Amino acid sequence: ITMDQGMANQASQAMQIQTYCNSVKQQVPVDFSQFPNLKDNQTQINQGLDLAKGHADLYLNTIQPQIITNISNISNYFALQNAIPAVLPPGSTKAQWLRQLSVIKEQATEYQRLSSDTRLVIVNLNNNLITDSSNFQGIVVNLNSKVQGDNGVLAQLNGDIDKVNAAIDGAIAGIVAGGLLVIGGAFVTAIGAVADFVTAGTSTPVVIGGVAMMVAGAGGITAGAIVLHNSLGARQDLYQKRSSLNSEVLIATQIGNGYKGLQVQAQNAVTAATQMSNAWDSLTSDLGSLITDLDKGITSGDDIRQLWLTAADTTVKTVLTDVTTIKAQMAGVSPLQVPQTDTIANFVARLAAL
């Protein structure tokens, strides 16, 4: 795997999980004070949610910065590489070459360590989310049995939501991935409720996993709304369609489906994180082989100079360009203002028809 794809994929996935985590943290705790036979159930829900907000926080506060630092190291690396054929003028001895390559390999290996450590901490996050996400599911089914509801209809909703959530995830990835590397590009995010929470009275909106992301320029917002609105509506349809499910249970299940959504974002992050480490490992081995071959009679400093100048003009200029535009996108990302009583699907529906 090339350094430009590993970087493009992790940047892309990070901006999506970032948004998702923001939606986790925005979720309000449930309110069942009306039915005192559910206090134990409320408590359970809200303790589970705080675990979900804990995982979200850990991602934004510990993992995201390392991802940002990684992107900056890719630039560090290639700028150091381009600089060597300038620091070592045409005479330069084999010794000089061995010292320079050995030094930049050291620096690169250190970047490999940051990236592999990151992969390891995302893996561990995911594993803890799988457990924490599976336990929440049981807190929902416990509540459902306590209101003598059908566990079978509940199950068919969870299954139906999981399939749609994957469609959403898919389209969002498509939007971000397709605009990520456009030189002037930016992104806007939208966080809203997965279901209507005002037509009937009791208002507990569920924004966890209720998300949308679009290109900020031109008619990017509209263009974005169009590919997103189908999948988003489909989900809202499933929570609004007539069902035997208690309302209190419908809330906890909405939350629970968002919780699941968080863990799938983590699993997507494992994938991207793995790809970026492998890109670093492939790079440190190539450097490793370059040193080894200079050390034998196979290559020379003059040959490496040649190889890194044609690289500096062709494949490196590309990478360094993308690194600039990627750091811009991630730092530039901006949130759309969503009306407090709106839904994410309705919001996007209306933006899609402008």
Residue numbers in the entry: 7 to 360
The authors write:
The structure of the soluble form of AhlB was determined to 2.3 Å resolution. AhlB folds into a compact five helical bundle structure (α1–α5), with an associated domain constructed from a mix of three alpha helices and three beta strands. Within this compact soluble structure, residues G191–A222, identified from hydropathy plots as a hydrophobic domain that possibly inserts into the membrane, fold into two antiparallel β-strands (β1 and β2; the β-tongue). These hydrophobic residues are thus shielded from solvent by packing against residues of helix α4 (E254–V270), α3a (residues V170–L186), α4a (residues G225–G239), the N-terminal helix (α1, residue G12–V34) and the C-terminus (residues T331–A359), which forms a short beta strand (β3) and helix (α5a). In this soluble structure of AhlB all non-Ala/Gly hydrophobic residues of the hydrophobic head are packed away in the core of the protein as the hydrophobic β-tongue. The hydrophobic β-tongue of AhlB is shielded from solvent by packing against α3a, α4a, the N-terminal helix and C-terminal helix of the tail domain in the soluble conformation. Comparison of the soluble and pore structures of AhlB shows that a major rearrangement of the protein occurs between them, in a similar way to that seen in the ClyA pore formation.
We show that the orthologue identified in A. hydrophila (AhlABC) is a haemolytic tripartite α-PFT, requiring all three components for maximal lysis, and we present the structures of the soluble forms of monomeric AhlB and tetrameric AhlC and the decameric pore form of AhlB. AhlC provides the initial single leaflet insertion, assembly with AhlB then producing an oligomeric hydrophobic pore, and finally recruitment of AhlA produces a hydrophilic fully active AhlABC pore. Structural and sequence analysis suggests this method of pore assembly may well occur throughout the tripartite α-PFT family.
